[PDB]
RNA sequence: GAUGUCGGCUCAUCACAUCCUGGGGCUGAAGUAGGUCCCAAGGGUAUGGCUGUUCGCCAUUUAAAGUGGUACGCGAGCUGGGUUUAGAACGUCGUGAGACAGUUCGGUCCCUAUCUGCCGUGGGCGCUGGAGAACUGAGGGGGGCUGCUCCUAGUACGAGAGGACCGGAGUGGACGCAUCACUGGUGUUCGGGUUGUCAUGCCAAUGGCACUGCCCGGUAGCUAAAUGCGGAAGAGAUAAGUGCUGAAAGCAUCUAAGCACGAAACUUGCCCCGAGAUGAGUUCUCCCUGACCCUUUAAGGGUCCUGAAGGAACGUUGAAGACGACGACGUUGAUAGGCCGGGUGUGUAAGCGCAGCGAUGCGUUGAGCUAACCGGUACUAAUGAACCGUGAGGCUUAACCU
RNA sequence: UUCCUUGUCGGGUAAGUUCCGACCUGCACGAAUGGCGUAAUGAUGGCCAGGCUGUCUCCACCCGAGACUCAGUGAAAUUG
RNA sequence: CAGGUGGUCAGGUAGAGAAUACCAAGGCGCUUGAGAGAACUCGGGUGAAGGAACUAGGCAAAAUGGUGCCGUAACUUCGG
RNA sequence: GAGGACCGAACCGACUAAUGUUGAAAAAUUAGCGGAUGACUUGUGGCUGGGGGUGAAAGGCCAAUCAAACCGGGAGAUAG
């Protein structure tokens, strides 16, 4: 409706980079510790990305010291500090789940070379 | 406190600024117009009668226009009674904002729920599901025994059945009021509010802390 | 989300391999264990000169879900495979004296700051 | 429950639901006019009414498009020559459901469905 | 499962009473042949608000 | 002329001789922790291993893992392991047929609900002219659990070890309600990939069938594992208990007169239903202000005229729904479909061009398509009517006006 | 085949009245109404492990056939 | 009347095949329909995390599944 | 090129589960299951007769019938 939409587009970010399915982003988040707030860095593949507007997310998967994490993130929240595309992978699909039974050489992306 | 007649408009999130998300529901509260207070002497008991909204004056019948026309308001989709409380004074014609929820912390909305229609007992009373397998027969999601023998005879008043579940006066109590908008008839209350999104709901300051 | 029959991998070097959830402490009819969560396992696979050994009783904290932890702005951490670190059985102290793979800060408490100090990585 | 969802299931599977629309769907635009139940004829509205505002843009690939949806070119052809131009000035609202008695054999409730602008010069062709 | 007891005929009456039918309330009369017909129905000639809209 | 018999499952309900939580007295009660008794039934009151098991033992929890009644509750609700038929075998007994609460392997669990009951949901009439709303609340139901950490305070207490009452704050478990913003599931109505085959004349492109052929994603809706909220505080009267004053009985004495405290029980407070509450309530608003005849002359019958408020019906329908019901709308119209725009999902259509011997690749191109979503739009369908419902509403008395 | 009996000890399990190994105290084994072994075989009995899973924790959604409503036809057991 | 009933005939594509899938010749849509899209029952599909905790018992379901090649234990009556 | 050999359709059988249980059916259906060159299966015809037959033996089978078939008769058996 015209009322939600209002209140939904005036919490918007209005710089978040343009980014699809396979390429390798890092994502910079507040991290609080009490009196400190630092950024902590998450680089990985953008396996998923939810377009719903202000509820848009996406889901970013890296091998973190031999165990696989994947992180979702909520694009438009105040937590996530930042967002950079490191390079563009070249997939055929919107939701790259098959990532997560492939490991190494298995789980490789072409570069999409625009 | 007496309380305000709103819509549920839907729900949405409200981002803090040190980085937290809080589900919102959005309630439509336009002026509420008093169109009768009913005082000790001529009723017995001290309330405000309140309309909201607008109506096509094709669809209000005679007896309903009489009753607006007496107020000298507007008539508005529905008509809600609130008890007054002691120190309270309203006069009828006189419009009442969102905004006197300024200071109001906590709330209590009440809705009709959704209507499931006619629900089995799994459903509407969380009975446990007998086996899927092991020999039962035509028995996965039947209720089981309703009773005892023949001591009593009979099954007890208020036994859990199948029936109509939802579609029903529901009230979620004590929900933070995280914001409101007086310019915009917005309120915007933390957590979810009982009924579908258009449903009509009543708000009124929490009536426990 | 662990409960009762669940094995776990161990990310920890008390010796252990794989161990199973037999009872999520801290409540009756509790029913799963998040990350932070303590419960009782049984060693099921150990290393042939580890401190522990199969068949031992002990209690673990989970550290890694598949299920994964919810932070305060919605968004998720998922794991690969459910991970815990073995404790003493009456003490509540790690055993081990390393951490593998990445934990989360739930674990940011006094009682677990042992943990936190050894992990390669907080998320 | 039902709460928002849309498509009658009309007591059949799903692959014959589409099969009966598409022969209902074609025998509208070869006649023009066809009786049917009442159930039928609203649900028909959502599938032929599509297939006139694909026949507005004549082209190889909306030709194509609409032969997928029909499976008959005597079809396709009479919607990209005759019912894309008849109708290339109105925006929806090409079928009109006319309510008339019950089925002798079972009551059911039938009615008519046609075509809105098939008046007395139809009989040219 | 089955009775214990013919029910009698002033019960049996009694489980009709909602089993009377409903005759039409009243008809429509179009406007130009001047037949009954059902509401919002076309008449027994083809005519609906006062237009033919079928040839049979 | 049949009352299906153990245990389990599902679903319970009551008792209190109380397992936990609450209130107390005594203690061989320092504290912590107990012992015992009194009051208290509001709520709560494990998961597994073994066994047909009830039980029990064991493992590990928990504030606690209560004891009983209910046809050893519950097979026209499930199960069929046990017991309890016919087969077979062992040990044993018998010359033998056979036998053994000895053992062993195998071994058909029917019933479409008339009545009572119960869960829901309507129709009728009533409530005294009719109608539309909003209420009052007699009465009924729901709900009532609890851990841990921190502060008070390492204080009181104690040789030390250890370690509080009372009071406050936070955070959990179990349970309940609501919801779909998030995380997800589903999504045979959306998009794509692909195997076999058949067809559309053929190529190309599509469609059918093979569990949706097999799969990969996925909108709305529904939904839990998702996230909001809940249990209270307070008040009244009390239980056991503790008292004040105080005689009978110069004293003493909580009691006899009188007065004060006192618990999750009781009555309220919170939520829901609720005027068929026939004791049928209240408030507001709206509508109807014609004749005439007959008769046994009355709460009488009849004819003509009149038909209101409103209702129902019909139609378009709904996050309402088995059907009824309930809600929205019916051209003075956004009710549904379509259409337009957007969004979302899928992932670069077809055609053409180029490269390649070719499979294929590249460009046009984030293309094409896109359900239930959002915002618009009278293009289609919601019709002029007709129908039901009337015409000022009994008697008595009392206070008021005439 | 053992009543006592869930004998005792060992193995397996966090926990094993079942299972496997042993002991001999054989209530009441025993040598063609055969004794003890035995590769292969078994829709045979018991037990364990891997894989696998809605069997379950704890159910959710969906597709169909009924149930429900309308039209036509039209039973049955039972019954002072 | 979803049962039973001997013999003969044996197309195409894929396939080891008379299996199976889709078709030819040929023959049929099974003698009540129409709506709706509740509980519940039946027959199916999918499922987060867990993976036998279910249960008398892995009952049922899920899973495995083809061809070629490599490789293959105890034990054995020398064949397995 | 042997085999009461192996895998597996027809064919014969009937281990499990669900459904059905006034059934579609007085024993079936659905999904799995066993045998499938043999102690195999099947057609047509024949033979064995009731204290008798036949029985790879279950008191099984002998026309939906079996610890003594069916039909008629003794017969209105007898019934504390």
Redesign the interface.
Known sequence: ?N??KQ??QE?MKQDVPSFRPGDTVEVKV????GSKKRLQA?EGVVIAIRNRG??SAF?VRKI???????????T????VDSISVKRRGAVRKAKLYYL?ERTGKAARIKERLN | MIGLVGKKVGMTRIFTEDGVSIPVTVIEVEANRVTQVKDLANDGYRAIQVTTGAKKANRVTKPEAGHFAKAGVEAGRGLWEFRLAEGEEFTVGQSISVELFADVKKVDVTGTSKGKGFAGTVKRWNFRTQDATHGNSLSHRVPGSIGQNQTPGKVFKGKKMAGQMGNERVTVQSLDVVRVDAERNLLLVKGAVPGATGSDLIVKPAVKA | MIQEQTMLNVADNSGARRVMCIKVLGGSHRRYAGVGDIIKITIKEAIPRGKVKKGDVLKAVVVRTKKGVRRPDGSVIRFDGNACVLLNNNSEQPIGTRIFGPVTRELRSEKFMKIISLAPEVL | MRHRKSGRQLNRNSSHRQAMFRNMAGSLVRHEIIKTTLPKAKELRRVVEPLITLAKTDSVANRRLAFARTRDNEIVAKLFNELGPRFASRAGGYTRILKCGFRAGDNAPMAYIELVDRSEKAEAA | AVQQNKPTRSKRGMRRSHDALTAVTSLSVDKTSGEKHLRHHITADGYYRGRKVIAK
């Open positions: 409706s009322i939600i209140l939904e919490q507040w991290v609080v510790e998450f202000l509820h889901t973190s010291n031999g165990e696989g994490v994947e992180r979702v993130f909520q438009h929240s105040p937590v997560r």
